Structure formats: structure tokens, C-alpha cells
């Protein structure tokens, strides 16, 4: 899934 500070 996506990195924390991405989005």
C-alpha cells in the first residue's frame, strides 16, 4: 500500500 506521508 501507500507510504505514510504520501497520499
Amino acid at each position, epitope marked *: 500500500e*501507500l*507510504d*505514510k506521508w504520501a497520499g
Partner: antibody
Amino acid sequence: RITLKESGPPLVKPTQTLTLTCSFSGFSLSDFGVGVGWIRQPPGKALEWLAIIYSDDDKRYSPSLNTRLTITKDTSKNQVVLVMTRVSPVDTATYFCAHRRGPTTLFGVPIARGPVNAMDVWGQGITVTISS
Amino acid sequence: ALQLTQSPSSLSASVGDRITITCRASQGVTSALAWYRQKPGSPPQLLIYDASSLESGVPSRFSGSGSGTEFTLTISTLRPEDFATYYCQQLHFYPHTFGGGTRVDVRR
């Protein structure tokens, strides 16, 4: 100045449980968005990412090792612990913990996320050998 | 999962050369990519974060560019301490993958 250092047993036997401790100074795991991760390196091989934990306590693990890893933090002792169960010989490697910056803030307002894209400070690494 | 392929895996060079190492991702990782240099017996050291930002205290001969699926690290004037192994790391998707590394050694 941020520094981290790994500690734990240099030798461990197959099927046993390995507990590694990362003790650090220069930052707090209560600081905004900070992370501490673990990376390993079998002799002569490439770096392999294992897990990371953030100050808001979100945890993430390598999918290949998920079932054998537990990462936890002890904020008041400035330590992060990684527990690996059921080790086998292929787990022999040098284990490093590392700091990950949280976003830069201005008057406590997040304004830059570029600094989170790297593990910026590393511990010297601790060599662990798995053999019966 | 996401694949990060470094090229070349090994590279020979001499002091003063300009070298460039490249890292390609199987899916786009935006700018969330970091480069490290690791000397024998030591931990990796951060050179470039967020694909192109120069880490504080890192010498200016190191440079990083690219975004998406293709990134490059170039050392403009190789110094003796640069004979080492370099790694790229993606931080857009979990798990936060590392490339296979590229060994830079003394040409002869």
C-alpha cells in the same frame, strides 16, 4: 546531533526468538511524524527493509517477514524494539535501525514532506549469527 | 511487490571521473527516493533525499535527479572515499524497497 545504536545477542540458535533494541538520542519518538525503522544486510548481500514505527504509533512490516516480526517503542526510554521469532540461518545479517524525519513544520504547521523521503541517520549496525 | 533495479550493478572508475548510477522502479514512486553510499564495514550514509535534495553536510559533487520511474545519482568528480557501494531506496510504497546496489571500484 542524532545518534542510534543497536544492541542484542550476537549469536542465536535456529527456532529461537531474537530481540533487538535500538537506543537513540537527539530526538524523541514523541516528536511529530518521526519514524525509526530496521534494515538488515546478510554478509555480502544488499540491504533489506524490515519494518518501521512512527511516533503516532503506526507500524508497518515487510510482507515477507510479517508473521515473524513485532516492532514496538518505549518513548520514555528512547528505544525501539524489534522482535523476530523462529529465526533460521538465513536470518544471519547485520541489523541496522535508522531515523526517519517527519515533515518540516512552521509554527507547528506541516509545510514540507520532502524530508521524510529517506532514512537520514543510521546506527553502526549489530552483527547477528544464527547457528545451532 | 515494487521492483527497484540499479544499473550498472558494478562499475570501475578512477579518481576524478564523473560517474552516474541509475535506478528504475517498476511503478512510479513520485519523488520519494533516496540515495546512499556505504563504505565497507560502515552503515549506509544518506547522500540525497526526495530524489534530488542534497543532504546536509554531504559534499556538492553528489547530485541526484529524476522522478516517477527513473532516477540517477551522479558524482561529478570521484574522490577516493567514493569507491564504495551505492544504494537507492524507494519510500512511496510499503515495503520501502532498496535497489540491489552498485559497487564502484578502482579501474585497472
